[PDB]
Tab-separated table of C-alpha atoms and ligand atoms in Angstrom:
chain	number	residue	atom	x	y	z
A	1	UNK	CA	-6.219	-9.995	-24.549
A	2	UNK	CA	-8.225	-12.245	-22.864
A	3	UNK	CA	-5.414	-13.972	-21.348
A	4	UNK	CA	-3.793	-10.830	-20.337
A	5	UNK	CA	-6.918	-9.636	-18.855
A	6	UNK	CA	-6.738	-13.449	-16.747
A	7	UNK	CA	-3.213	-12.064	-15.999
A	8	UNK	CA	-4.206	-8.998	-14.254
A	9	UNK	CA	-6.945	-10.639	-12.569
A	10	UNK	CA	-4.526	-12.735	-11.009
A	11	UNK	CA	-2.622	-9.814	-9.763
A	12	UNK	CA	-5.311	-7.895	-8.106
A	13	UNK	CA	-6.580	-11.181	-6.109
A	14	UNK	CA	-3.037	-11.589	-4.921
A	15	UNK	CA	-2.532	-7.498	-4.094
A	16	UNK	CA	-5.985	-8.122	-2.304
A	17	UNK	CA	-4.926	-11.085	-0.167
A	18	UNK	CA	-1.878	-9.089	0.537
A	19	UNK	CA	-3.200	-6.175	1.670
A	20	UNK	CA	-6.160	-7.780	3.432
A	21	UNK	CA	-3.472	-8.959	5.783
A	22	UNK	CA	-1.888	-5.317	6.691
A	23	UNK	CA	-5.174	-4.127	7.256
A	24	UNK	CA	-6.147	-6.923	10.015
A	25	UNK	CA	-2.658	-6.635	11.819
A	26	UNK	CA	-3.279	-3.986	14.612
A	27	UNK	CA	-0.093	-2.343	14.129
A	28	UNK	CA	-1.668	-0.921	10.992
A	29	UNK	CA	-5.314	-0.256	12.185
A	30	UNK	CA	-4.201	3.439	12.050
A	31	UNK	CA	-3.338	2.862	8.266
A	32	UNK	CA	-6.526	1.319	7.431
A	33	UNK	CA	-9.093	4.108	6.694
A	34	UNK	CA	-8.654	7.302	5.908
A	35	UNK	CA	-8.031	10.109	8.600
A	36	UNK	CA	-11.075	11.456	10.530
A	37	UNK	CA	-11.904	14.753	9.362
A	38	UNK	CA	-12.855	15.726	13.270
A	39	UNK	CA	-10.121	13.414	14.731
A	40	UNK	CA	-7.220	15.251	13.396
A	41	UNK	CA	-8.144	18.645	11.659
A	42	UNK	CA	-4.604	19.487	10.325
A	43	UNK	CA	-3.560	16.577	8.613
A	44	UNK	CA	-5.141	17.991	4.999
A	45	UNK	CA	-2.853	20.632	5.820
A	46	UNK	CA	0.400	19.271	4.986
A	47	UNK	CA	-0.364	15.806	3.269
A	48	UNK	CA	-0.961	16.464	-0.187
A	49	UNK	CA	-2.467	13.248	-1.161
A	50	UNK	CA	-4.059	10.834	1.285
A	51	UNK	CA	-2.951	7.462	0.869
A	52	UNK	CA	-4.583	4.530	3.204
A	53	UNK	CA	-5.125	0.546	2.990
A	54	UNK	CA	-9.063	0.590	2.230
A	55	UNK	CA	-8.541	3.395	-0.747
A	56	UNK	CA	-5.694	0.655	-1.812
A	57	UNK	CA	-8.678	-1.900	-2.180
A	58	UNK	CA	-10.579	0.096	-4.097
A	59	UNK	CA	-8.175	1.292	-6.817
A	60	UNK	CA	-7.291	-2.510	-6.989
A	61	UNK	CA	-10.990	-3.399	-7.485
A	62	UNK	CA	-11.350	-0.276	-9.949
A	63	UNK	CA	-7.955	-1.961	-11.756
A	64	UNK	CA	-6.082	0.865	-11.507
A	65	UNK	CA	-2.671	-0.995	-10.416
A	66	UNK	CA	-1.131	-3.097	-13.560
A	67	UNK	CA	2.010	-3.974	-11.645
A	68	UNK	CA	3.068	-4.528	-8.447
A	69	UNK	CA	5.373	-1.966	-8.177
A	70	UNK	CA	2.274	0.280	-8.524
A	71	UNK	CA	1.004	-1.198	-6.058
A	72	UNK	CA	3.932	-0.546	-3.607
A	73	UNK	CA	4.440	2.910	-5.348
A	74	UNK	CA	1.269	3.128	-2.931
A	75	UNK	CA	2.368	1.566	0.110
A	76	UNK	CA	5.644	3.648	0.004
A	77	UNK	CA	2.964	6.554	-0.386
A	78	UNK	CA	1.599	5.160	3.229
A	79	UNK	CA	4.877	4.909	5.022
A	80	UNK	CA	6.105	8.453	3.150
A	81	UNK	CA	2.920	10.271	4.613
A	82	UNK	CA	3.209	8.922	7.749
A	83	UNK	CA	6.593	10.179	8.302
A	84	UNK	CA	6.294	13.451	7.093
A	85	UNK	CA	3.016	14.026	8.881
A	86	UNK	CA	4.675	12.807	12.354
A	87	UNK	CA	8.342	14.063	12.197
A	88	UNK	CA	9.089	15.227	15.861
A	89	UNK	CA	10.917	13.237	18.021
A	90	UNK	CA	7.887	12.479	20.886
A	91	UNK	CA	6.716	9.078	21.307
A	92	UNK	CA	3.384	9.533	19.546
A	93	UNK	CA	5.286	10.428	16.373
A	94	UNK	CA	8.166	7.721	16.786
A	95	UNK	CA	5.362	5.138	17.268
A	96	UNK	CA	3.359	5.861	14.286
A	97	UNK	CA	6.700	6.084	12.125
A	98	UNK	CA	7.719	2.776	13.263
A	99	UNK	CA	4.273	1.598	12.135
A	100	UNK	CA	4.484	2.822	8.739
A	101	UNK	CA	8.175	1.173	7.977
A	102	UNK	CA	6.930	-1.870	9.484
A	103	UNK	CA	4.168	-1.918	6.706
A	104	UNK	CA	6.038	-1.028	4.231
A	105	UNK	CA	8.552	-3.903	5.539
A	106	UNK	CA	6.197	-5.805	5.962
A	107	UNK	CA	4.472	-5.258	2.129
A	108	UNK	CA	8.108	-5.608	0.636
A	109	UNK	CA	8.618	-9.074	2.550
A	110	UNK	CA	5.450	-10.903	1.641
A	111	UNK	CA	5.838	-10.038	-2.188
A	112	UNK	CA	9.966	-11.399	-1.457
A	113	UNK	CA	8.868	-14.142	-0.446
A	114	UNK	CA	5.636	-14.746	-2.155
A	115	UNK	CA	5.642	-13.285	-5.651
A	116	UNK	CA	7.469	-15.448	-8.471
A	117	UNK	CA	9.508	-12.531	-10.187
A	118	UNK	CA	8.406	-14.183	-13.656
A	119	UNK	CA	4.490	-13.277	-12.784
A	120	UNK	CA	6.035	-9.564	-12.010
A	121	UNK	CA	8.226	-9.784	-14.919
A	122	UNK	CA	4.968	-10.509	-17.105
A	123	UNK	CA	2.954	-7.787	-15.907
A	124	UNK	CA	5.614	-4.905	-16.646
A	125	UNK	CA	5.943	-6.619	-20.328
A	126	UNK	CA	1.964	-6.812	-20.682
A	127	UNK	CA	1.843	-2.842	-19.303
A	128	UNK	CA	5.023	-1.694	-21.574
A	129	UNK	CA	3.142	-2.819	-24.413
B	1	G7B	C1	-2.137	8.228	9.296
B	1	G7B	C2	-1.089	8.992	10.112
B	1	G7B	O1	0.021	9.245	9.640
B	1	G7B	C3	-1.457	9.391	11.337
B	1	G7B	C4	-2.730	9.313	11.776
B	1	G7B	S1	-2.751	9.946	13.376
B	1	G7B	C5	-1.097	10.298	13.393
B	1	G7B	N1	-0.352	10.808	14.393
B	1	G7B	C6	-0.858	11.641	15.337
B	1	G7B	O2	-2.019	12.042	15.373
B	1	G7B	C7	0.115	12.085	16.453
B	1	G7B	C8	-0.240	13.506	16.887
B	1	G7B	C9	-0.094	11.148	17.629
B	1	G7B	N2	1.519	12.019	16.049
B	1	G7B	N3	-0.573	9.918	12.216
Protein backbone atom coordinates (compact mmCIF):
# COMPACT_ATOMS: atom_id res chain seq x y z
CA UNK A 1 0.00 0.00 0.00
CA UNK A 2 0.96 3.31 -0.26
CA UNK A 3 0.33 4.01 3.24
CA UNK A 4 2.08 0.98 4.36
CA UNK A 5 4.96 1.82 2.26
CA UNK A 6 4.72 5.62 4.39
CA UNK A 7 4.73 3.15 7.36
CA UNK A 8 7.97 1.56 6.72
CA UNK A 9 9.49 4.67 5.71
CA UNK A 10 8.85 5.88 8.99
CA UNK A 11 10.58 2.98 10.52
CA UNK A 12 13.80 3.07 8.70
CA UNK A 13 14.24 7.03 9.45
CA UNK A 14 13.72 6.20 13.08
CA UNK A 15 16.20 2.80 12.97
CA UNK A 16 18.55 5.40 11.18
CA UNK A 17 18.43 8.11 13.85
CA UNK A 18 18.88 5.33 16.26
CA UNK A 19 21.67 3.81 15.06
CA UNK A 20 23.35 7.02 13.90
CA UNK A 21 23.69 7.58 17.60
CA UNK A 22 25.62 4.12 18.53
CA UNK A 23 27.83 4.73 15.82
CA UNK A 24 29.01 8.39 17.09
CA UNK A 25 29.34 7.20 20.83
CA UNK A 26 33.08 6.13 21.13
CA UNK A 27 32.35 3.20 23.13
CA UNK A 28 31.11 1.69 19.89
CA UNK A 29 33.69 3.10 17.33
CA UNK A 30 34.98 -0.53 17.32
CA UNK A 31 31.38 -1.63 16.22
CA UNK A 32 31.10 0.80 13.52
CA UNK A 33 32.79 -0.67 10.37
CA UNK A 34 33.56 -3.80 9.59
CA UNK A 35 36.85 -5.57 10.82
CA UNK A 36 40.13 -4.76 8.99
CA UNK A 37 41.11 -7.55 6.93
CA UNK A 38 45.03 -6.70 7.93
CA UNK A 39 44.09 -5.49 11.48
CA UNK A 40 42.89 -8.73 12.75
CA UNK A 41 43.49 -11.73 10.30
CA UNK A 42 41.57 -14.41 12.34
CA UNK A 43 38.41 -12.96 13.01
CA UNK A 44 36.79 -14.61 9.52
CA UNK A 45 37.91 -17.57 11.21
CA UNK A 46 35.42 -18.11 13.78
CA UNK A 47 32.64 -15.41 13.08
CA UNK A 48 30.42 -16.80 10.66
CA UNK A 49 28.61 -13.75 9.67
CA UNK A 50 29.96 -10.24 10.18
CA UNK A 51 27.59 -8.02 11.67
CA UNK A 52 28.60 -4.10 12.21
CA UNK A 53 26.69 -0.58 12.58
CA UNK A 54 27.51 0.86 8.93
CA UNK A 55 26.32 -2.68 7.17
CA UNK A 56 23.12 -1.95 9.62
CA UNK A 57 22.65 1.38 7.56
CA UNK A 58 22.77 -0.08 4.54
CA UNK A 59 20.33 -3.00 4.85
CA UNK A 60 18.02 -0.24 6.38
CA UNK A 61 18.52 1.97 3.28
CA UNK A 62 18.20 -1.29 0.99
CA UNK A 63 14.73 -1.93 3.26
CA UNK A 64 15.63 -5.05 4.27
CA UNK A 65 14.38 -4.62 8.08
CA UNK A 66 10.30 -4.53 8.23
CA UNK A 67 10.27 -4.55 12.01
CA UNK A 68 12.17 -3.53 14.66
CA UNK A 69 12.81 -6.61 16.10
CA UNK A 70 14.74 -7.25 12.84
CA UNK A 71 16.43 -4.67 13.40
CA UNK A 72 17.66 -5.72 16.92
CA UNK A 73 17.77 -9.40 15.64
CA UNK A 74 20.94 -7.43 14.21
CA UNK A 75 22.21 -5.63 17.05
CA UNK A 76 21.97 -8.84 19.21
CA UNK A 77 24.03 -10.24 16.12
CA UNK A 78 26.72 -7.32 17.17
CA UNK A 79 26.85 -7.97 20.86
CA UNK A 80 26.65 -12.09 20.08
CA UNK A 81 29.84 -11.76 17.78
CA UNK A 82 31.58 -9.75 19.94
CA UNK A 83 31.42 -12.11 22.73
CA UNK A 84 32.16 -15.12 21.09
CA UNK A 85 35.03 -13.60 19.17
CA UNK A 86 36.61 -12.20 22.61
CA UNK A 87 35.79 -14.90 25.26
CA UNK A 88 39.01 -15.04 27.49
CA UNK A 89 39.11 -13.48 30.57
CA UNK A 90 42.10 -10.61 29.72
CA UNK A 91 41.20 -7.10 29.77
CA UNK A 92 41.21 -6.59 26.00
CA UNK A 93 38.44 -9.18 25.73
CA UNK A 94 36.42 -8.03 28.96
CA UNK A 95 36.55 -4.48 27.50
CA UNK A 96 35.24 -5.16 24.14
CA UNK A 97 32.43 -7.50 25.74
CA UNK A 98 31.36 -4.79 27.94
CA UNK A 99 31.12 -2.66 24.79
CA UNK A 100 28.94 -4.86 22.93
CA UNK A 101 26.21 -5.33 25.97
CA UNK A 102 26.37 -1.74 26.43
CA UNK A 103 25.12 -1.38 22.74
CA UNK A 104 22.91 -3.74 22.80
CA UNK A 105 21.66 -2.00 26.22
CA UNK A 106 21.91 0.77 24.94
CA UNK A 107 19.74 -0.16 21.42
CA UNK A 108 17.08 -1.93 23.74
CA UNK A 109 16.73 1.37 25.95
CA UNK A 110 16.25 4.01 23.30
CA UNK A 111 13.48 1.89 21.45
CA UNK A 112 11.93 1.46 25.55
CA UNK A 113 11.79 4.57 25.81
CA UNK A 114 11.29 5.95 22.40
CA UNK A 115 9.21 3.61 20.27
CA UNK A 116 5.26 3.73 20.83
CA UNK A 117 4.58 -0.16 20.95
CA UNK A 118 1.41 0.60 18.65
CA UNK A 119 3.95 1.83 15.65
CA UNK A 120 5.82 -1.72 16.46
CA UNK A 121 2.61 -3.42 16.82
CA UNK A 122 1.68 -2.08 13.18
CA UNK A 123 4.68 -3.11 11.49
CA UNK A 124 4.54 -6.93 12.64
CA UNK A 125 0.66 -6.81 11.42
CA UNK A 126 1.71 -5.02 8.00
CA UNK A 127 4.78 -7.87 7.68
CA UNK A 128 2.39 -10.95 8.86
CA UNK A 129 0.26 -10.08 6.12
C1 LIG B 1 34.38 -6.34 16.49
C2 LIG B 1 35.03 -7.18 17.59
O1 LIG B 1 34.38 -8.03 18.21
C3 LIG B 1 36.33 -6.97 17.82
C4 LIG B 1 37.10 -6.21 17.02
S1 LIG B 1 38.69 -6.22 17.67
C5 LIG B 1 38.28 -7.23 18.97
N1 LIG B 1 39.06 -7.67 19.97
C6 LIG B 1 40.40 -7.85 19.85
O2 LIG B 1 41.04 -7.67 18.81
C7 LIG B 1 41.16 -8.29 21.12
C8 LIG B 1 42.32 -9.19 20.72
C9 LIG B 1 41.71 -7.04 21.77
N2 LIG B 1 40.30 -8.98 22.09
N3 LIG B 1 36.97 -7.52 18.88
Amino acid sequence: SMQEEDTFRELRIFLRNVTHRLAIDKRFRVFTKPVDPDEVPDYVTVIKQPMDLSSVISKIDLHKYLTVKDYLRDIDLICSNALEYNPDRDPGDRLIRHRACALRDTAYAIIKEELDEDFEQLCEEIQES
